[PDB]
Design a protein around this nucleic acid. Structure first.
Ligand SMILES: O=c1ccn([C@@H]2O[C@H](COP(=O)(O)OP(=O)(O)OP(=O)(O)O)[C@@H](O)[C@H]2O)c(=O)[nH]1
Ligand SMILES: [Mg+2]
Ligand SMILES: [Mg+2]
Ligand SMILES: [Mg+2]
Ligand SMILES: [Mg+2]
Ligand SMILES: [Mg+2]
Ligand SMILES: [Mg+2]
Ligand SMILES: [Mg+2]
Ligand SMILES: [Mg+2]
Ligand SMILES: [Mg+2]
Ligand SMILES: [Mg+2]
Lengths: 315, 141, 266, 49, 142
RNA sequence: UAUGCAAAUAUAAAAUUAUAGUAAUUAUAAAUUAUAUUAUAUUAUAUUUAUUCAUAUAAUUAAUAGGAUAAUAUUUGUAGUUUUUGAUACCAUGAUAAGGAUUAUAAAUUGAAAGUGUUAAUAUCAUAAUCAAAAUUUAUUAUUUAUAUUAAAUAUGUAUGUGUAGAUAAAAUAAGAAAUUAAAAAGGUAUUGUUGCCCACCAAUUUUUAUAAUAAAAAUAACGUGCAGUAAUUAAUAUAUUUAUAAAAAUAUAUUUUUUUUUUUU
């Protein structure tokens, strides 16, 4: 009785009533409850994971001989979680000079991959020359048999995305099932960077090819970084690719799709500053990603909105 | 529990009256203060009646013997320096030590307001004849 | 016929998003479809609302010293303000400035989680002091006016759910938020470890540990606000070796690892 | 009789003995527990359809 | 309450003449704050130690536009007299000004210089009934 | 206070009123209505102590949001103004207090339901709420009374007057008190019932007639006098005679549709 309701735990007139347990009965537990055991939820935090590497790990496997031999050259290149500020010109000079002296293929290529990664972080454009000078001959040209070491490919790809470069499309294509079959070994961050670059450059077709492979190779869709999905989708103006992207959008999860919308509305919105290159206007893809989000969320009832104009009829 | 009636408005020109009244109440208080300081110090400085009650012992004894001998020859100077104010007098008697434990226990002293009378006081009425215009808390003559 | 509290208001979110977003129907709260919240107040109105609601101290109150009216009326009597230049003639000015309002990080636990001595409580989380945008506290610029409106105002419009949120906060909320909104791994995979303002302190720790002063070094390690570089952990454990202190070497290592991002794993 | 206390306990404690109830119920009968729409003067507000 | 002199007239009950624990009465009304003592002049309703610093309220703490009245626990300082600046205090009905500066004020708090309950009474803030009751007590003439 | 005149309840009758056309009825008795000196034993009020009684102020109540030792979400930094109106300073139902008057001693309580601001369906004037340092008029409150008297939150300057008017307060309980009590008979024109009903004159009007200060009678809901009646503030009722603002009142007889008080030779 009142506008303030009784709280059923603290009130003995609830607790000890006939619909609950009186204090003179024997007070044991009624039934056991196993909730967590029967059907358990997987852990997904609202906050992203604080320790994760957040980059493209380039996997440095060197024989612990050349690793010691080449130390004064390698000390200038990135080691794990450490990014020395050495100017990229110098590093490339060192590779060009000293590398023909080393005899190992595997070593020369690990070293090269480090150089590429280093040049990806500084966004120096003259590093593809290195690909055409050493690797192109035995990997990409005229159906050469040789199969490049994975780390090298990851590194070059990462470089083509960081420095936006038409070249990526040629490399990526070699990684599908009939080629090197490297695509299932890519990191989630790899996909993230790829999508973002392709999106900036604006290839709907690059975007489609990449989303198809990602899906087939079972990438982690929900953990692909939202910004990069948005920038990729934003690039899609062509009727067919557009169709593809609706049908595809059904592959994300409820949550992912909600934040695809949030992120999208921010990047053309308040957070338009957050990007190094501003987005381009897609009103169509924006509207659609919002629409999709609305379709996939639970629906709420707002009767004064729906039935605002309802009039009954006696027909 | 009835709804509280509203209070009438303040007054017209009562702000001026209140200002003036407090103003010169304070100005008056300056002289009341000055005067009562004068009185307080005049009292501290001037002599008082003897603090001890002579009706009990060791004080009843003839002025030529006992405690009075002890006072005339050893304590006199000091007793006069403090002007027979009852606090230092009682302390001096404690420090003379030749009475010793008795001061508080066997000896009786006059009550506060009587002990505060000016030396020479003859009639009891004197307690009530001191000035009431002055704020000393009975520490004025 | 129409009585409003406020004449005009404004939209929380801007043209690019809104103009398209409107073609998608959004469900409003069924029992009160229209929402006019404190994000929607105009600049003027927000200023006014934000002054009020702080008992005596707050700038709204005529006698706080922050009042912009030149005159105030007590029971039909009009009182003219005493300007501060004049107030100062008999009432000396001892004013430190805004740094006086912010204690160091070191004291945050003495103070139950706060660095800020201002009149409103200041949260380090994004949401409680949120206006349209996420709340962020400047420790340099703290004023009585509080332009960004990040403080927890007790009496303003829309305050109640904020107050309730603040009273539900977890045991480390202030501390955790302060720590996670600063101090986070860079987008390159680099550690947050190198900062210009803390560098000489890390240098000093290393130096102290090399001369073998373990206690002095540990005593400086205490005052570090930011993640210390690997070199610090190296120095400190190397110092633990000759005296055999193992417990200390281990607690050092374990401190730098899986708390501080595994700087210690080396 | 009247109820002194009330507890929520799984239905398998007391359920009509398997030989009294019709044969496999899950498979041969579609059952839904639902609420009467009409106003029920007395009796239960839920029924088994 | 019977008469509402403020907002609180509506919210509060008197409860007759009710006893509160020692030195906690809900409302601090210091009728005694100006209560003359020559010998106790420096110890009564003032700081318990003469080595205490003056309160907060003698200082300008922050960036101010200005104030209307200074607080009543502010202590009167030689500059209050000398500087010839407005010194106001909030008393009732409105405000008390120190207009006529004296050194005799110095070193005491304005609590002590402002008589809270004046011997002066407004007949116009009184109901005819209340005026009757003030004539019974032998305050107002009639 | 029975020499003139003077038939008249002791019942011969057909629903009430009305001079025998007026209104639609009237009259009536036992339900119900707290105080009228009826009796030992189951055991006591006439003691003690008290009574100078004051305290309130400086306006914005509207939503969720998780972080080390987790198999990777920048979801770091979650951004869609604007259609409603009551608890307010204001009319806006509910609910708990206080207040001794006859279930007694044994293995046992001297505190009660009849309701004292804050609480749940009547809305359609207004932001009034303490975070200090503040302005006595309000029935409803046990203060320190003469050897020694202001040190920590700031803490009360006033009234010595022969224990002295009127009027008041408290107690039979781990304390200590000791001798002057009630029951049983009663009336209602009202009908949840005396704050109940009713009675005449005094205006308008309506209607019938056998027109007497001012025709009579019947309907009737104003205004103004009162207080006639219900054992009703000197009981009523009937006849008689007188009297008169109006009910009515005085006296002479009968009488209870008024309540009762009771010597079988003292
Ligand atoms: O999800 C996020 C959040 C933030 N950022 C941050 O945005 C800043 C500029 O935003 P951009 O996303 O335009 O820069 P970028 O492509 O050059 O950055 P990379 O991701 O290639 O490093 C970047 O330098 C990065 O720090 C992201 O790149 N992604
Ligand atoms: Mg009530
Ligand atoms: Mg308020
Ligand atoms: Mg006629
Ligand atoms: Mg007639
Ligand atoms: Mg009568
Ligand atoms: Mg009569
Ligand atoms: Mg009668
Ligand atoms: Mg009669
Ligand atoms: Mg008459
Ligand atoms: Mg008659």
């Amino acid at each position: 009785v009142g506008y303030t309701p009784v709280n059923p735990d603290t009130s003995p007139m609830v607790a000890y009533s006939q619909y609950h347990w009186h204090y003179n009965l024997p007070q044991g537990m009624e039934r056991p409850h196993s909730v967590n055991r029967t059907f358990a939820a997987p852990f997904q935090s609202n906050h992203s994971l604080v320790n994760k590497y957040r980059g493209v790990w380039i996997e440095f496997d060197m024989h612990p001989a050349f690793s010691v031999a080449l130390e004064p050259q390698l000390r200038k290149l990135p080691r794990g979680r450490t990014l020395p500020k050495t100017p990229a010109e110098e590093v490339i000079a060192d590779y060009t000079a000293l590398a023909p002296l080393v005899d190992d293929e595997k070593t020369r290529d690990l070293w090269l991959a480090k150089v590429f990664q280093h040049c990806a972080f500084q966004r120096c454009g003259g590093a593809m020359e290195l690909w055409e000078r050493y690797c192109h001959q035995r990997f990409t040209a005229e159906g050469a048999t040789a199969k490049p070491p994975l780390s090298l490919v990851k590194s070059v790809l990462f470089y083509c995305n960081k420095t936006d470069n038409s070249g990526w499309r040629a490399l990526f294509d070699r990684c599908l099932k009939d080629g090197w079959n490297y695509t299932p070994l890519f990191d989630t961050a790899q996909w993230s960077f790829m999508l973002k670059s392709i999106g900036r450059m604006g290839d709907e077709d690059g975007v489609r090819a990449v989303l198809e492979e990602m899906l087939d190779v079972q990438a982690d869709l929900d953990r692909v970084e939202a910004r990069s999905v948005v920038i990729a989708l934003n690039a899609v103006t062509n009727a067919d690719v557009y169709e593809f992207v609706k049908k595809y959008l059904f592959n994300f999860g409820e949550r992912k799709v909600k934040f695809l919308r949030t992120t999208y509305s921010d990047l053309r919105g308040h957070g338009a500053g957050k990007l190094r290159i501003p987005l381009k206007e897609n009103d169509n893809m924006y509207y659609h990603v919002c629409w999709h989000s609305s379709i996939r969320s639970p629906r709420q009832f707002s009767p004064r909105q729906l039935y605002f104009d309802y009039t009954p009829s006696t027909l | 529990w009835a709804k509280p009636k509203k209070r009438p408005k303040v007054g017209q020109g009562f702000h001026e009256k209140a200002q003036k009244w407090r103003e010169e109440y304070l100005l008056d208080r300056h002289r009341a203060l000055a005067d009562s300081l004068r009185a307080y110090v005049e009292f501290s400085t001037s002599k008082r009646v003897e603090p001890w009650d002579a009706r009990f012992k060791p004080f009843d004894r003839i002025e030529k013997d006992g405690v009075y001998v002890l006072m005339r020859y050893m304590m006199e100077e000091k007793l006069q320096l403090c002007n027979y104010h009852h606090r230092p007098v009682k302390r001096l008697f404690c420090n003379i030590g030749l009475m010793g434990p008795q001061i508080t226990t066997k000896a009786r002293w006059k009550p506060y307001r009587f002990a505060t009378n000016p030396a020479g006081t003859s009639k009891a009425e004197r307690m009530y004849q001191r000035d009431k215009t002055v704020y000393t808390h009975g520490h004025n003559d | 016929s129409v009585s409003g509290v406020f004449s005009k208001g404004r939209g929380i979110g801007h043209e690019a998003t809104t103009s398209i977003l409107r073609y998608i129907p959004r469900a409003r709260v069924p029992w009160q479809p229209s929402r006019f919240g404190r994000e929607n107040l105009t600049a003027a109105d927000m200023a006014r609302l934000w002054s009020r609601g702080r008992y005596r101290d707050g700038p709204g109150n005529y006698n706080s010293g922050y009042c912009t009216e030149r005159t105030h009326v007590l029971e039909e009597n009009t009182v003219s303000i005493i300007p501060r230049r004049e107030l100062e003639k008999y009432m000396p000015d001892i004013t430190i400035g805004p740094k006086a309002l912010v204690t160091p990080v070191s004291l945050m636990n003495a103070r139950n989680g706060h660095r800020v001595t201002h009149d409103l409580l200041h949260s380090y989380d994004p949401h409680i002091g949120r206006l349209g945008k996420p709340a962020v506290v400047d420790h340099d610029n703290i004023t009585v006016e509080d332009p960004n409106r990040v403080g927890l105002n007790a009496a303003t419009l829309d305050c109640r759910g904020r107050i309730y949120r603040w009273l539900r906060r977890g045991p480390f909320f202030q501390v955790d938020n302060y720590f996670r909104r600063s101090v986070k791994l860079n987008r390159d995979g680099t550690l947050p470890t190198d900062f210009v303002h803390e560098a000489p302190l890390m240098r000093k720790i290393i130096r102290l540990a090399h001369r073998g002063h373990l206690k002095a070094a540990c005593e400086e390690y205490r005052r570090v606000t930011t993640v210390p570089p690997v070199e610090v952990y190296r120095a400190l454990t190397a110092c633990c070796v000759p005296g055999a202190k193992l417990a200390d070497a281990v607690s050092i290592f374990e401190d730098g690892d899986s708390k501080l991002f595994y700087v210690s794993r080396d | 009789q009247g109820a002194v206390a009330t507890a929520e306990i799984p239905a398998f404690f007391n359920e009509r003995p398997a030989w009294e109830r019709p044969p496999l119920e899950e498979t041969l009968y579609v059952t839904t527990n639902k609420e009467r729409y009409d106003d029920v003067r007395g009796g239960d507000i839920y029924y088994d359809d | 309450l019977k008469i509402a002199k403020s907002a609180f007239g509506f919210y509060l009950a008197r409860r007759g003449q009710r006893k509160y624990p020692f030195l906690r009465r809900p409302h601090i009304k210091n009728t005694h704050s100006m209560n003359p003592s020559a010998p106790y002049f420096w110890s009564f309703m003032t700081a318990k130690s003469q080595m205490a610093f003056l309160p907060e309220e003698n200082y300008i703490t922050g960036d101010w536009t200005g104030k209307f009245f200074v607080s009543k626990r502010q202590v009167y300082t030689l500059q209050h007299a000398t500087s010839g600046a407005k010194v106001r205090v909030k008393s009732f009905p409105s405000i008390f000004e120190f207009n006529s500066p004296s050194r005799w004020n110095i070193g005491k708090e304005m609590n002590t210089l402002t008589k809270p309950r004046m011997d002066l009474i407004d007949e116009q803030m009184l109901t005819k009934k209340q005026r009757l009751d003030y004539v019974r007590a032998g305050l107002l003439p009639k």
